[PDB]
Amino acid sequence: AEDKLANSDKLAPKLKRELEIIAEDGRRAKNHLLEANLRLVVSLAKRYTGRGMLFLDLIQEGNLGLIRAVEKFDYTKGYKFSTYATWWI
DNA sequence: CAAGGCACATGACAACGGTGTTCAGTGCCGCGTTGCCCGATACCCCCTACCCGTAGTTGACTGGCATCCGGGCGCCGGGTCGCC
Numbered sequence: 001a002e003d004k005l006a007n008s009d010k011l012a013p014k015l016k017r018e019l020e021i022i023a024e025d026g027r028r029a030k031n032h033l034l035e036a037n038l039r040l041v042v043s044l045a046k047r048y049t050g051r052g053m054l055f056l057d058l059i060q061e062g063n064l065g066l067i068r069a070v071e072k073f074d075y076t077k078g079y080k081f082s083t084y085a086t087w088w089i
Numbered sequence: 090c091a092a093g094g095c096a097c098a099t100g101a102c103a104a105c106g107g108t109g110t111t112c113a114g115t116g117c118c119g120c121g122t123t124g125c126c127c128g129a130t131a132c133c134c135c136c137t138a139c140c141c142g143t144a145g146t147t148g149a150c151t152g153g154c155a156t157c158c159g160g161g162c163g164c165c166g167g168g169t170c171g172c173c
Contacts, residue, residue: 039151046153055153077147084147 001026033070034063037085041066044089065089 001019004011011019045059053061069088073081 037151041151042153043151049153072145079147080149082151083149086150087146 030070033081034066037066037070037081038063040082040085041089044086062089 001022005016005019005023041062042059045055045062048058049055065088066085069085070081072088073084077084
């Protein structure tokens with residue numbers, strides 16, 4: 001939807017708003033996924049705590065890795081998101 | 090006995106002696122004042138070796154940490170909920 005909106009060719013206004021709405025719903029689902037995986041990322045932050053970096057800082061950096069991973073994740077892989085994410089985390 | 094005539098020496102007279110200056114010229118023989126000559130030195134090039142940053146890696150793997158009491162001591166000062 002956002003790809004089609006990004007193109008310069010003219011689209012109908014109602015169709016453009018529908019595409020924007022679908023992209024917004026995708027954004028909402030993205031944040032749903034991130035909040036779901038917050039627990040995994042804090043677990044992996046535990047896994048590297050106590051090495052001179054504050055635990056919440058490690059959590060935040062892992063969260064950066066998490067947003068990267070979701071930005072690079074899709075169902076085309078026949079695996080759960082948990083297995084794929086942990087590498088990027 | 091006085092006056093006039095000859096010896097030696099004498100007031101100056103220059104010119105040599107010997108030696109000290111003079112402006113004069115030209116060198117004599119030590120410092121320099123500069124053209125080379127090289128020699129080294131900064132400064133472009135090419136090559137590759139290695140430091141450092143970026144980007145993947147798919148069974149599954151979904152909430153942690155150990156705190157903290159034997160100050161001690163008092164006050165300020167505010168909050169905080171009972172009180173009637």
